[PDB]
Amino acid sequence: EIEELRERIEKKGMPEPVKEKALKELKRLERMQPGSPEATVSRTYLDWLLEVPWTEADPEVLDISVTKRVLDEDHYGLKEVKERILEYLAVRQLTQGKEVKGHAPILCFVGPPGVGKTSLGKSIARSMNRRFHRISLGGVRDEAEIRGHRRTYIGALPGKIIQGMKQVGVVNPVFLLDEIDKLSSDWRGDPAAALLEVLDPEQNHTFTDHYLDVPYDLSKVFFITTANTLSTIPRPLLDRMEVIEIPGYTLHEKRAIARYFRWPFQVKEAGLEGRLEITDRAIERIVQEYTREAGVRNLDRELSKVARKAAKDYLEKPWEGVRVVDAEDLEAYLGVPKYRPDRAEKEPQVGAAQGLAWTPYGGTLLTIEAVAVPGTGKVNLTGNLGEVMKESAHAALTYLRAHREEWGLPEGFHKDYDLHIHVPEGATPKDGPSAGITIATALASALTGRPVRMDIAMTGEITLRGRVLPIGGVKEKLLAAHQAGIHRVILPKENAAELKEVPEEILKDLEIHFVEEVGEVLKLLLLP
Amino acid sequence: EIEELRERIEKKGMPEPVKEKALKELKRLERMQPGSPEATVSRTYLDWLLEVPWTEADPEVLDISVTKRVLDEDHYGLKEVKERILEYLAVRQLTQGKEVKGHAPILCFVGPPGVGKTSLGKSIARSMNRRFHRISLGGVRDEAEIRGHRRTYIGALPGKIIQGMKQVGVVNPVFLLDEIDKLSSDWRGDPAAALLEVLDPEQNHTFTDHYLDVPYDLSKVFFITTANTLSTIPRPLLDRMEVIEIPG
Amino acid sequence: LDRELSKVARKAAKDYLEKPWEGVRVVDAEDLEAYLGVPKYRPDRAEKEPQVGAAQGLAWTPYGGTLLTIEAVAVPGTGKVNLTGNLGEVMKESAHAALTYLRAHREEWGLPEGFHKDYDLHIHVPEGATPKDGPSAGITIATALASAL
Amino acid sequence: TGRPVRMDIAMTGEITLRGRVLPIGGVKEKLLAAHQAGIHRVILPKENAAELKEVPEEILKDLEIHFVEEVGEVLKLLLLP
Amino acid sequence: DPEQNHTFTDHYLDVPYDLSKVFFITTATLSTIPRPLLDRMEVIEIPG
Amino acid sequence: QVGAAQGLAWTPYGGTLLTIEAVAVPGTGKVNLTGNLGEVMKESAHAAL
Amino acid sequence: VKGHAPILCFVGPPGVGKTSLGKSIARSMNRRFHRISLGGVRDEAEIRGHRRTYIGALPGKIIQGMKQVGVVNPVFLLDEIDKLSSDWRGDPAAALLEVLDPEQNHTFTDHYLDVPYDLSKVFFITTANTLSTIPRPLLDRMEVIEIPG
Amino acid sequence: VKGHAPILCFVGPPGVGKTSLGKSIARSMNRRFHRISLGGVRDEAEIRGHRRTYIGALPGKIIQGMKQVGVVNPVFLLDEIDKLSSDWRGDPAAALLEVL
Amino acid sequence: EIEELRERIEKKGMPEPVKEKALKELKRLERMQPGSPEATVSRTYLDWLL
Ligand SMILES: Nc1ncnc2c1ncn2[C@@H]1O[C@H](COP(=O)(O)OP(=O)(O)NP(=O)(O)O)[C@@H](O)[C@H]1O
Ligand SMILES: Nc1ncnc2c1ncn2[C@@H]1O[C@H](COP(=O)(O)OP(=O)(O)NP(=O)(O)O)[C@@H](O)[C@H]1O
Ligand SMILES: Nc1ncnc2c1ncn2[C@@H]1O[C@H](COP(=O)(O)OP(=O)(O)NP(=O)(O)O)[C@@H](O)[C@H]1O
């Protein structure tokens, strides 16, 4: 078996900096005593170089169009991540090593928890037909989980990248790292230095892990690093790694994600494979009323609760569960409504405004309400938000002190009327301090006394001249307006580029008035 | 004593990659001096592969009425979680004979302290007639207290979840993980990040620890997680878990 | 920057592998939005209008250069002057210096006599650049106050 | 106003600035605590009927509920002069 | 807790330990005791 | 100058020069804590008023 | 008496062409070029200070630069020196002060080798982003060059 | 009579020659000099000394500055004894009094 | 090699409670082999002390 291992040196394709080291320590091996623990770690090392993959690679798939359909039967809502991975097929299909060095197959997914990004590795690997290992760095604390240990230590096995190479079998595989942002650290080694040693283009060609002291190749292997936030990444690994900021799943892909992918898996898990149906209206109801995070995890757990309450009905009595579950029988399955929808009741309320902003948990409507009472010259915003709505409120009222003859206001209303503004808590300013034109028509509906009809949705901000500021995150608030059955949404006119992100089945109902001026907002909206 | 270990592997009913890995480590352990510390760490390694279970499972009784009467003979009036247990049995009565990826779920029990949501796992063990090991996770600072150390660390253990796999001995236990809200979350220590591997219902069967260091099949473990408040659970970890929100 | 150049070259490569016609492919600014998805930030360019009562300020921050707008409307009220923004009050102090210049020069531009007390002023700061780097755009506010009043 | 309220009517709700009664959460122990003292007429918001159906039978058969949309419907009941 | 002092799982003492025979007595102000612990161990209100 | 005051204050930057500026625009009458004050300079402004 | 000049500090954001100016200055004096990464925390106590009685990998990373460059007067691109100081036990040491100062640049005792190395006439380029978390026994006497955006 | 005298505190704007004032006392005294600059070291237990169980345990910066002199009397400088950041993790005021 | 350090003890390791720690460190020096990974800390200990 010493000569069998000597044949298996040259049988593999095992490269030239490792070959004379393997032959010289095998030359050390046959003359010394085989019962030794030094002989044990020697035979472990010269099992490890001849089991780890070096150049024996799986065949890369020669065409894109049969991988996209395997992605289309595994994940739905990540179209941009699908474009980034067939983008990697477009890079590796065209090149195939035409004097090219300086590769970066190093990809990251950061988003809300439970959006998809640890189940990509059972889909990317099925797509481009490469074998998969799911490497875990959840509670990896020491550096030596990836860095390994020296062979002078008794009991030495290599790092978990090399143990991943032990399980996957072939070189050029795919990796999914499980957690990055809460990869913790201690003394005697920070594992961010170990992932520096993994994830550099300078040292993907050579690795030099501290068990296999020769260079190792991490070049052809493609990486997924999975995290939830960008704040607690170690800043070098945040720096020299390609980040995809995954946006949260909202309802108009959640209706598809249930019926296509998530519901049939768990009614296969329950047992009613063809013996349960759900309406699309109950799926839409579950998302607007029962789920309030951006991931589909309690979509999975409460449609799982629909499936197992249907199994409880199907086993306590033999009656058929092939009844379809609509909106109003769903409360027998799931009990109390945990959350409540937003009512765009189309009768004109006197001092209200149809507000739109976005939570990080999806696009959610607001209702900014305001009254004017003849008091003093002061204002008070009382809706659990900061001063970024307060400066828009002073912007709105100092717009409305101009054009006083236009809207029928009294001559001294600023020092005569107290004005109070309520906002809901769903407006979260990190990119969206939104709904400024809702504040402006709340001031205009309070002071004039003329009602605001609820037929028209609104999104903007206020400059004091009478012009509007643009907004981001336009997709989730337009489909949140499409959720409530309200079809007339006000946008700034310079937000015309965001209609290309919306496909036509949502866009055919949404009567988008691209409106740049606040006087045009108050002329289009405010019911006399 | 290595010549018992081969047929202990063969009647243990291991899966094929971990079975070939344990037989390869047994071929390593055949040749060496048995007095070495490598011999005792590989002997502890093969021993820990044998007395963890792989295909040994207690039979789940499919009686809804026996489970309901044991749930009513230990607890009163906890209607959501008692309906949850009988519909978990209604899943497992229906899927018995259908080979699907049977992930037993991850229950979260929030509410005020003292409801009995925090020591329900003894009654859950009596109601399944499955074996029990409540796992101490009260304010743990150590991530390798959950996922273990490697065997290069000299007196290493695979964590308390695999120690529950020892002392239960079958592949479908109930684990009362106490005080999941009370885990410290910091850059120096965060074992809630170690809870994210072992409590994900699509990849618990690819749980790698650090001492067995193989994908261990944790689809059939009926995990129980407890908390006295909602918000101090980390934002990945509360998302993973069936929150049976039972109030005061 | 070179991350987004990486993404536009590979987005060119994706339609290269399904349409192989590219012996030459020129990309100007108009088909840039076909790549890279949503516009992340927005260019504060020239507003292309010659005459309305506001001006264009400047600032400098390590995010880069920008073309700030400072605007004010002189509403007929109590004579208060307040800032509207989440930056420092030295911008309002430079506005106060502009107020002393218009009180010292109330004749040559057709101002009313009691303009200091017959006009409420709110002064906009829409922005986030210059915390203490270059935190003064005082003649922009002086044109804003004089064109408002 | 110098006017007292009714003695058998306890109440719960949420206020917005127009006067629309927003619904509340966790009502079962609130209704049975109002049932526990000498109150058998409670004010609820209008859209807490979905929470009130989860509340059991003896709580709904002992007391009286009032589904309220606007706070003028509250103050039409509880101002004795 | 007497439901799990019989199965108290120490980090070093890996096998669960029996502590339910042990008379634990604790000392203290209520407000800086945590909420599960002040609900969990029997208060003896000793004033001045 | 009608509002400026040529002042002297000791700094850890050595000797410094001041332009103490006050306009007092008509409003609610409160003292505005402008110009990045310390814990004592509002007390000096209260002594002035 | 001042045979060696004080050493630079390129400061700026992460992403500027500090490697491009290092390759330019090594092309300027007609010199083979080495880049020193020092990317993570890079504990000099753990990885420089071996004292030769381990297995003995990386005998000082300056000497690992020297065996790669093969010439006695290279341009060392020292990078990310602001990332040196750690919040751990023995890991902040600032042991490159003995490397960089001219009063013991001519001699150089190594952590591994324990032999006085001739590190005379060795040019150094130190590039580090944020000026605050530099070790102060470097920037008390090193030069600094502002590279803005 | 008493071997210990009080210890100098130089304080002012940064850069008024205080390191060179210690160097000029070193040149007048014909005695060696070292300057350490604190603030980067965030630990008492770095300076006072961690135990030998840690595998890369180098000792403190103040005895590093004392051993770089190599003589039992240095004109020792403690630069930046006040400018310490908010992360007072292992509190170095007790060790910096206990070396003083 | 281990006698140049003792030359440094009886030339500049003069005080007795200081040198008692170095003497039982010298006792520990011939206990393990000087190629073990623990012995780096032990040799660095009395080199830094001496
Ligand atoms: N597009 C999709 N199609 C089908 N199933 C999906 C899709 N997105 C999510 N899922 C399912 O929802 C689950 C949530 O994804 P998950 O892998 O938990 O992401 P993640 O939690 O953010 N990564 P991590 O936080 O480290 O666990 C997946 O395991 C899938 O089962
Ligand atoms: N429905 C019930 N029927 C009978 N006894 C009950 C019931 N609910 C609660 N109890 C009792 O009240 C106790 C409350 O549990 P508790 O002691 O708080 O758990 P715990 O010790 O806190 N577990 P943990 O804090 O997670 O480690 C139970 O252990 C029972 O003794
Ligand atoms: N009062 C002084 N008279 C003459 N020369 C001076 C004086 N103060 C400083 N210098 C010069 O400045 C040098 C001292 O360096 P300097 O820039 O002051 O830093 P430092 O004060 O010594 N250390 P630090 O105070 O911590 O920044 C001396 O070598 C002189 O060349």
Residue numbers in the entry:
A (entry chain A): 250 to 777
B (entry chain B): 250 to 497
C (entry chain F): 548 to 696
D (entry chain B): 697 to 777
E (entry chain C): 449 to 476, 478 to 497
F (entry chain E): 598 to 646
G (entry chain F): 349 to 497
H (entry chain E): 349 to 448
Kindly provide excerpts from the paper associated with this entry:
The N‐terminal domain of Lon facilitates substrate recognition, but how the domains confer such activity has remained unclear.
Here, we report the full‐length structure of Lon protease from Thermus thermophilus at 3.9 Å resolution in a substrate‐engaged state. The six N‐terminal domains are arranged in three pairs, stabilized by coiled‐coil segments and forming an additional channel for substrate sensing and entry into the AAA+ ring.
